[PDB]
Amino acid sequence: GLDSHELARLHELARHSHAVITRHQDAGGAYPAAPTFSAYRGYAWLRDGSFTAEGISRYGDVASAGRFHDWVDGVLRRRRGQVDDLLAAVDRGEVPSNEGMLPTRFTFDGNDGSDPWWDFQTDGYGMWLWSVVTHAARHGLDLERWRAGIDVAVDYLLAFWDRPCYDWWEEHVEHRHVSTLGAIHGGLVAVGTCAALRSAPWSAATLQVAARIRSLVSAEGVVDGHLVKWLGSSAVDGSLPACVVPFGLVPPDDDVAAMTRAAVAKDLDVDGGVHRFAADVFYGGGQWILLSALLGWNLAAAGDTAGALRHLRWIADQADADGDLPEQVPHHLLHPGSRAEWVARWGTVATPLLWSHGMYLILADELGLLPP
Numbered sequence: 001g002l003d004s005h006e007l008a009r010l011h012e013l014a015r016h017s018h019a020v021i022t023r024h025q026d027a028g029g030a031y032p033a034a035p036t037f038s039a040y041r042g043y044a045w046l047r048d049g050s051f052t053a054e055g056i057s058r059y060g061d062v063a064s065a066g067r068f069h070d071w072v073d074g075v076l077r078r079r080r081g082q083v084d085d086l087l088a089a090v091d092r093g094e095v096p097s098n099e100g101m102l103p104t105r106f107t108f109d110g111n112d113g114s115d116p117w118w119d120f121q122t123d124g125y126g127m128w129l130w131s132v133v134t135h136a137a138r139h140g141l142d143l144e145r146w147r148a149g150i151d152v153a154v155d156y157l158l159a160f161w162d163r164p165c166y167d168w169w170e171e172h173v174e175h176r177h178v179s180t181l182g183a184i185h186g187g188l189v190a191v192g193t194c195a196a197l198r199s200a201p202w203s204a205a206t207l208q209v210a211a212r213i214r215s216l217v218s219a220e221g222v223v224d225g226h227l228v229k230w231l232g233s234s235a236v237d238g239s240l241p242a243c244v245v246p247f248g249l250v251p252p253d254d255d256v257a258a259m260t261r262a263a264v265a266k267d268l269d270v271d272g273g274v275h276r277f278a279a280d281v282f283y284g285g286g287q288w289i290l291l292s293a294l295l296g297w298n299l300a301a302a303g304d305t306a307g308a309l310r311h312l313r314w315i316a317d318q319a320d321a322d323g324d325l326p327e328q329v330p331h332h333l334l335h336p337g338s339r340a341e342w343v344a345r346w347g348t349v350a351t352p353l354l355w356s357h358g359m360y361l362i363l364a365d366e367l368g369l370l371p372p
């Protein structure tokens, strides 16, 4: 199994992951993506923050995770009128432009941090529903604390789930991305199957829309037995295992789950470090900590503890002298000639990336390795 040498190092990286996340959590409750990376500093993402919050909730820091959910909830209640206006526009047949949608980046005070024409994404609102329900179930909490923000997110996603948008990586606005569909599905099934939310007006609708998402993925999101990066594509994306665990398009034991884990591993995993997609030129297309953790989580869930452990160890080997985990490492580059221009333009790779730490904690917990 694991010797005292490796257990001590993995425990310390878990302790440090909790510390770096809670040290950089904003006073208002937001988790930032990266406190010192030029292009990300000063902003929060619901994607990063939701997976971060789920690592912290598993770790057992109820107070920290709860302040994140408070933050998100209050940000979303503030958009009640914005969401109602977009729904009324749809009802009039005046479909709003990407420029009018809810944002991707948030400032720590809950304002738009970016222009959605350039980065419109719907996945983070589905990930937040999955996160807050999973947290409340784990710690026995009353979801009425965050219900009015849940209601905004649900209403928005029931309207806009089928809209093309940019993927997790802020690319390809014209497409419908399977890990985006998957994030929405996970959020909708989490609220639709939640006994505390049984009387919500949208209860039945969330499970009917989740079924519509699965129908779309069955028709256009599966090729040669595996999920694909966007509807109508043949290629895989490193984000796709999230459609198994945690978002539940198919269970871990399904043939499409197995075929998707094997395709991601064959096409994108080098020596334990998982690339985003074949064409990735961002910093040369490096190996992403959070994706090695996502694949490891999916292997643990399917009963492949050994494969899970190999990916955990790979991630632990990327910690720097202070125990900080970067976004990505360049040990294998898909497009080595593209790295220099990114380092010149934005600097050295985001380190720490809080989502890297959040995912480390999830995978550690899946393997029973959080300090006792």
Ligand SMILES: [N+]
Pocket: 300, 301, 366
């Ligand atoms: N699991």
